[PDB]
Amino acid sequence: ASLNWSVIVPALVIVLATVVWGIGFKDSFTNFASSALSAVVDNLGWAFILFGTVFVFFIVVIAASKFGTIRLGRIDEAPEFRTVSWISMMFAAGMGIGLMFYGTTEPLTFYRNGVPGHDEHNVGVAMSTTMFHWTLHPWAIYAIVGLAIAYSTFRVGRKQLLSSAFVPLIGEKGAEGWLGKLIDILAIIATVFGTACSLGLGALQIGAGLSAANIIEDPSDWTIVGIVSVLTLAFIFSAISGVGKGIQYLSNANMVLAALLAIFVFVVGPTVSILNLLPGSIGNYLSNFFQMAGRTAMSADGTAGEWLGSWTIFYWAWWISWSPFVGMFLARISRGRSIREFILGVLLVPAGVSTVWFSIFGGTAIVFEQNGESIWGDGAAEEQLFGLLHALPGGQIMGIIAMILLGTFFITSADSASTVMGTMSQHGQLEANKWVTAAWGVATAAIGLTLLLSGGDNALSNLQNVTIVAATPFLFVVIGLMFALVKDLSNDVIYLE
Amino acid sequence: ASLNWSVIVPALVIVLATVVWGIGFKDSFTNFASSALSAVVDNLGWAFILFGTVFVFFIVVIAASKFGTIRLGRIDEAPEFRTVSWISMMFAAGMGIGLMFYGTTEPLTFYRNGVPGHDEHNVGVAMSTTMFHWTLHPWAIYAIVGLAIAYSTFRVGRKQLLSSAFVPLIGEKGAEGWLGKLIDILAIIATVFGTACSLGLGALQIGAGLSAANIIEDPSDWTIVGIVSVLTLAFIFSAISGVGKGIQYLSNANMVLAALLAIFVFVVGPTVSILNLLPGSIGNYLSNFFQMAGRTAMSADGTAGEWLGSWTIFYWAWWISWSPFVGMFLARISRGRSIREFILGVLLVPAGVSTVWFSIFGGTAIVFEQNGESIWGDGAAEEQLFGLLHALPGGQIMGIIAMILLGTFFITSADSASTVMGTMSQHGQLEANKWVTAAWGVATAAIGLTLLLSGGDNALSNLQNVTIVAATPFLFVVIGLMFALVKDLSNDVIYLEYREQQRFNA
Amino acid sequence: ASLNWSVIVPALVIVLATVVWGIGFKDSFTNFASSALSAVVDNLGWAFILFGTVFVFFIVVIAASKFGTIRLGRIDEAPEFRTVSWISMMFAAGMGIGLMFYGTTEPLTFYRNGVPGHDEHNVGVAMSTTMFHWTLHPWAIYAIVGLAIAYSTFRVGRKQLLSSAFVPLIGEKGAEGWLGKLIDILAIIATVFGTACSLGLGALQIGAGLSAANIIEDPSDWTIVGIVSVLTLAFIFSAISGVGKGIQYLSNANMVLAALLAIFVFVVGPTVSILNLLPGSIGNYLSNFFQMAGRTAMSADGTAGEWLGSWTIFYWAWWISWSPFVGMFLARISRGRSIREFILGVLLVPAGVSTVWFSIFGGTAIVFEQNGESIWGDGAAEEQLFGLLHALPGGQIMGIIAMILLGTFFITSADSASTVMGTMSQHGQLEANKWVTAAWGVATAAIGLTLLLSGGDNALSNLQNVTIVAATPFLFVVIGLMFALVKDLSNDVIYLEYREQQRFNARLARERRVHNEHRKRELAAKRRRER
Ligand SMILES: CCCCCCCCCCCCCCCCCC(=O)O[C@@H](COC(=O)CCCCCCCCCCCCCCC)COP(=O)(O)OC[C@H](O)CO
Ligand SMILES: CCCCCCCCCCCCCCCCCC(=O)O[C@@H](COC(=O)CCCCCCCCCCCCCCC)COP(=O)(O)OC[C@H](O)CO
Ligand SMILES: CCCCCCCCCCCCCCCCCC(=O)O[C@@H](COC(=O)CCCCCCCCCCCCCCC)COP(=O)(O)OC[C@H](O)CO
Ligand SMILES: CCCCCCCCCCCCCCCCCC(=O)O[C@@H](COC(=O)CCCCCCCCCCCCCCC)COP(=O)(O)OC[C@H](O)CO
Ligand SMILES: CCCCCCCCCCCCCCCCCC(=O)O[C@@H](COC(=O)CCCCCCCCCCCCCCC)COP(=O)(O)OC[C@H](O)CO
Ligand SMILES: CCCCCCCCCCCCCCCCCC(=O)O[C@@H](COC(=O)CCCCCCCCCCCCCCC)COP(=O)(O)OC[C@H](O)CO
Ligand SMILES: CCCCCCCCCCCCCCCCCC(=O)O[C@@H](COC(=O)CCCCCCCCCCCCCCC)COP(=O)(O)OC[C@H](O)CO
Ligand SMILES: CCCCCCCCCCCCCCCCCC(=O)O[C@@H](COC(=O)CCCCCCCCCCCCCCC)COP(=O)(O)OC[C@H](O)CO
Ligand SMILES: OC[C@H]1O[C@H](O[C@H]2[C@H](O)[C@@H](O)[C@H](OCCCCCC3CCCCC3)O[C@@H]2CO)[C@H](O)[C@@H](O)[C@@H]1O
Ligand SMILES: [Cl-]
Ligand SMILES: [Cl-]
Ligand SMILES: [Cl-]
Ligand SMILES: [Cl-]
Ligand SMILES: [Cl-]
Fold it and tell me: Could you tell me if C295 lies within 8 Å of chain B, comparing CB atoms?
């Protein structure tokens, strides 16, 4: 068994130490997450924001340049999968818990309260601000990490390790040293917290649906611990892959379920209004793109700092911490692809899905607010989806299917994250071990479950703050990854000819 | 000649079926017009607004691509005219009744009343919202229908028919079958209504111009029909005596008269303020482009849908319905041009016209408002050009001139458009029959009049509601054209030659 | 090479006359200046605004076009300076008295007062409206003139003269003719007034700065004169010892001082507020670029006119008149560069320095407003920097290196500008006469002085109105350059050969295709009904 302990030890130490400090000393850890938060959002907020937009310029430039004609693998190697399966796999890429949690909440919030530098009840700014958090910006980050890997791996022939994409800068000798193995630590850690966050929101939201439907009175810690345990244990099993039910038949299910949800709302809901929001969202997104990118704590006369720390800066941090996972995943399905094909696919396909989704769920929630039938309730994110569903014919049933799609996501995403996390802790092995995979998943579900307990009534608040913290170091890794990718792409063979 | 009665008849039925319904049962017609207008604007407005902007994106990307080097004709062919003569013909294409009618009215209305999403009395928004309706958007559609007809006619030797452009998707068999014919019929229907709308506006506007010159008490019904009838007959004269002699000669009048109005107002009006609106309009239009693109019934907190229906969605439908004609015209003058050079020319050249024309008329109207000398009057579009004219030295004369210009425009527009309808009904014959041509000119002017009459006090509202309803089926044609055109260009030999030299070397 | 007296005299007369009109009849000069301002802003205001943005597009299109592969010199000639030294000389270039004077004041002013079409206290608009006046728009102008001069001199091998750039429209006999000289004359007149503006600005600021350090409280003309005199003398004793030597070591102090000034206020002031304004500036700039570009006197319901002639248009005018100098400076340092390289550097680099400079100072000056610690004093630009500095731990010491800088900048600017004028009055001669250099230098300082004196209590308003009236003619020269520049690059050997190989290849391609097509028609004819 090839297990790089120099990276697995410090990684697992940070994880478990965070669990002790969380489950044991509630007040202590919940206070730490709130002051480190302010520390980062006030002193490094300008970096998350400035470079987040640089990632977008950089990535489409790389595509416009000659490096785009280059392929990922041997010279003039054909794509592994046929286009239609590459594209369809970038859908399950787009879909997920985040869109289940914020689909209704985010657009609804921005419409009601308004957004820094605009007044309340502005549909366009609501839709555009949402698109902004879920389209080009996150996937630019996913393309950077994904490319750096896919190139360092298929083309140049290195190990599928984040530290191997840093060779052009740190030398073949760095990746093997401590720095390369530090990169792999922060990679796994970021993935843990970035994934845990997802698991938290997932459980936090299902427990709410258990109350919406009256299967439960009101959720308690013993309920969230109940959900997380069933889903975690459901993961431990499926992690040790069987035959009949596989990780890629859950994606299929995820799809049909997600599709059933979306279609349902779309049809029974206000249809042409959702249709209006398609051009509506896109027009306004492009219209406000640079304004939104210019927003800082200095915006709206020194006022926007807090709104930022609860939305934009949270998402960026989250997107960063989640990059190793999504990046590696995007590499593993894009071998044989050209660098220009790869980027255009990453930036446009997932954006299609998120657009349609927020137009449906965000759209309906806003169409309710305009007709004096607010689904807002007591203003608790977790509840809002079920609020929207129960407001429509047959909405009773669809609320339960919603609970399942969430549980299957919990497990579907638990596998993917764990696998990659293992690959990164085994010197870059392709098919990781089912006993480290399952091990990482457990600690990932543990971390997540913790941030909900420590938080308590500020669980969502606590879930976010901690993410922004664990993602800060890795932010610079992704930044340097631009240079290491530029040096590599320059030292290529075709490009020299 | 070779008449395609299978096409002509179903197209001639609906038209006459409309004149009888409208001139026979005013109320039953106006009740259907206003009813359907609502179903289309409410259920399909998203479509006009989403694809209206997809068109602009599409046609620009096409030009940016390898397909751009291809030529509208045989390999390495070259243009028949100098590019200067090409530009001049596109300049003169940018003019017409629509500019006359809406040149003063539009940017004024937006300034007085304000625009959904904005405060009233906003100059930049008034102009940018106008540009939006009269530049890139309409010509992106003309370009799309032009490039399809040209590439089909000059690059592949198919008939100069719209259905021929759908060969890559429908096949040779299909383009001779029903689907192919349906496409040709919707083309002719869209052309007659989209043109009748032009003739209608013109008739209304000239009738209103008779009153401002005090040559009549009131634009009454037995006067509008008298205007249409006289101009219609003058079209017959110009039609039998060779359509060629008329169009080219009247265009001369058109450009001479038009140039006079424009320079008169430019020199006698607030010259400097008009000049400021040049970079003014361009800067704002670029600034607010995507903002305007994204506007729908959901915009402005869910309140903007009605404005949309009276403006944006109106124009889109109108540009769409007119596309077969102005596209066939764009093809017939653009052979041997490169696809890329063609796309840029069609977008930019007309834009400059509208841009200048609106800065002169709209800009002057706005300056009047600002200085407590509003020209708005009773708030009726047709009266407002004459409003602005009579507010100037010598304007009483120029008001007569603008009447003649509207008359010529009426005739050159019916000439041009009727020719294309000939071609579309004679299996793609370039020179139509002077009888099949004149036949269309009458049916068209008759529909123009049937729209005005059936309306009553709201002729304009009726003239816009029917146009939107009519143009609705053909919006989907133009959408599929995109898919058709890309399939063709992908099969083209020269471009297949470059992805052939890029798969070998690389 | 001989002095071109036919070009020298007419310029020196226009200048000397102005100095007379101003210092002789303060009340006849001020009037004409103020009446001509109106005439220009009202009638040509649209042209500055339209073409100011046209310049930006034009130069971006050139760089993107095939023209951008052409090298400014012999075919595949290597650059005189290395890539890293050239860039640095563009950093140092972008820093001037303009940055010192307006650095604090401009965004502060926009934040407090707002700009047409917006309300006060808009941080984004404050920063964006500033980027507009100090980034792409002026350096496009510079890039254009620099290119026309670099390509004309280094590639075609002509005289280093603006009249040369018009050879492809006017001819070698046109450039030697009256119009050609007229161009050079206007290029001189434009430069002296443009530099004079920068020199006046310097005096007003270094003057207010003596009264802020409480070193002088005799606020009068005998003091402003006392500054333009000492510094002018300093100019005459630097262009006499060797202008080529001073410009170097004198400039290297100009940067460390600028760097101490910058780093100081960045470290002591609201550091993470400033960092915040970096992406806040760039983003808001991109966001409002066209909205700003569309701002005319019909904007804000026919109201923006007044604000326009004090900010946007005065800057456009200022950048135009200063272009013969800046562009020539750029040409001379850019030899061996590709047109694209050059354009991409002239644009992107000075933008970096302006963006950071305005974030540090202007940003600091806005954070104070938000905290009720408002600087502004009596609302005077000339004082605001020193004001800002004083409210900082060290504002007294650093509020004096600012004094030095302004003087040092005064000298460096006068030296650089005077050289270009010499070359421009000596048939494109690189190293120009010593007494003819100091001559223009003195005369240029005389105008700046005059502008301030004829001005009175409103010295700026006068200093600006003139800079605008003296730039007007040269706006048409810069427009003409677009046409000249295109004619020239179109007849460049390397481009002609390229467009020639495109034809041959298409022709060659067509032969291969059309024949193969002929063969298939035969091969099909045999297989079918036949075989
Ligand atoms: C509204 C929605 C968003 C749309 C955003 C898209 C708009 C941007 C489009 C920009 C297209 C530019 C043209 C693309 C082709 C460029 C080809 C190119 O220059 O490649 C260079 C490579 O360029 C880069 O990778 C660096 C640039 C990356 C992007 C930086 C963006 C910074 C963003 C800051 C804000 C934006 C403004 C500044 C843009 C520069 C070549 O480098 P080299 O070979 O000289 O390097 C040798 C190496 O040093 C050897 O070791
Ligand atoms: C909604 C519209 C849908 C349209 C669907 C159209 C379907 C057909 C699209 C094309 C299919 C065939 C693709 C291959 C042929 C065309 C493309 C091609 O091969 O030509 C190249 C040439 O294309 C171009 O020159 C376009 C350059 C502009 C790209 C700018 C990047 C995007 C930034 C957007 C804003 C930028 C604005 C900057 C200035 C304001 C494109 O590659 P490249 O530009 O990445 O490479 C450059 C060089 O040739 C090879 O390295
Ligand atoms: C008015 C609206 C503005 C936004 C929308 C603009 C309209 C859309 C235009 C999109 C299509 C543009 C297509 C341009 C293709 C030009 C290609 C060409 O012919 O010249 C060369 C390509 O030209 C270039 O290299 C890029 C031009 C220089 C960089 C771009 C201009 C400077 C921009 C600086 C920023 C200033 C503007 C910022 C905001 C726009 C050929 O490419 P290459 O094979 O030499 O490229 C190799 C590459 O350099 C290395 O891989
Ligand atoms: C200040 C904002 C930025 C400026 C605006 C964007 C500027 C984009 C400039 C794009 C490059 C223009 C090059 C000019 C031609 C010089 C000679 C030349 O090099 O020819 C090339 C120039 O050819 C082009 O790239 C044509 C690009 C067409 C872009 C169309 C933009 C139209 C926008 C219209 C907007 C109208 C708005 C209305 C109000 C103004 C041919 O090569 P290619 O690039 O076609 O090759 C690519 C590929 O290998 C084969 O396709
Ligand atoms: C009508 C435009 C209104 C918008 C605002 C414009 C304000 C200025 C108007 C200037 C003319 C606008 C464009 C009018 C159509 C094109 C006119 C043109 O450019 O010349 C045409 C000739 O135009 C005319 O004879 C009638 C209109 C004349 C207006 C332009 C020429 C004016 C000549 C005197 C100008 C006086 C001032 C300058 C004197 C040097 C065509 O010449 P051609 O032989 O190349 O054309 C071949 C084509 O197939 C013919 O159909
Ligand atoms: C073809 C359609 C439009 C397309 C674009 C065409 C553009 C063609 C080029 C036009 C360039 C004109 C640039 C100068 C402005 C012209 C208008 C003008 O000068 O002011 C007008 C208006 O004049 C005024 O109201 C007063 C202006 C006073 C200007 C005084 C300037 C001289 C001041 C003396 C000192 C100058 C010192 C200069 C030192 C360099 C005078 O026009 P008008 O007399 O023909 O008509 C008057 C009005 O429209 C109707 O009665
Ligand atoms: C705007 C209102 C008044 C109208 C004024 C006139 C301007 C509008 C009309 C514009 C029509 C032409 C637009 C450009 C079309 C070029 C498209 C093209 O053909 O691609 C070529 C790209 O290359 C070029 O043709 C470039 C043009 C050659 C000269 C280059 C000049 C560049 C100058 C750029 C300055 C732009 C400044 C504007 C900025 C706002 C390569 O194909 P080709 O057919 O030219 O092949 C070459 C030859 O024909 C045989 O093969
Ligand atoms: C949103 C951006 C849109 C950009 C515009 C499209 C970009 C270009 C896309 C690439 C090429 C498009 C044209 C070809 C697409 C399909 C591939 C192809 O080559 O077409 C053939 C293969 O096409 C296909 O396999 C399926 C494509 C369907 C055919 C095209 C449909 C056009 C859609 C029009 C929508 C109008 C809606 C009307 C509703 C009443 C068609 O021949 P067929 O005999 O096989 O017929 C197709 C099928 O059997 C019919 O059932
Ligand atoms: O060569 C003729 C060929 O025609 C067939 O195509 C049919 C098939 O039904 C079908 O493949 C084809 O439609 C495919 C694309 C449909 C686009 C129709 C557009 C019409 C205009 C409005 C936009 C849409 O329509 C044709 C007519 O019904 C099939 O391609 C073959 O069976 C046959 O060989
Ligand atoms: Cl390759
Ligand atoms: Cl061809
Ligand atoms: Cl405005
Ligand atoms: Cl809105
Ligand atoms: Cl702001």
Answer: yes
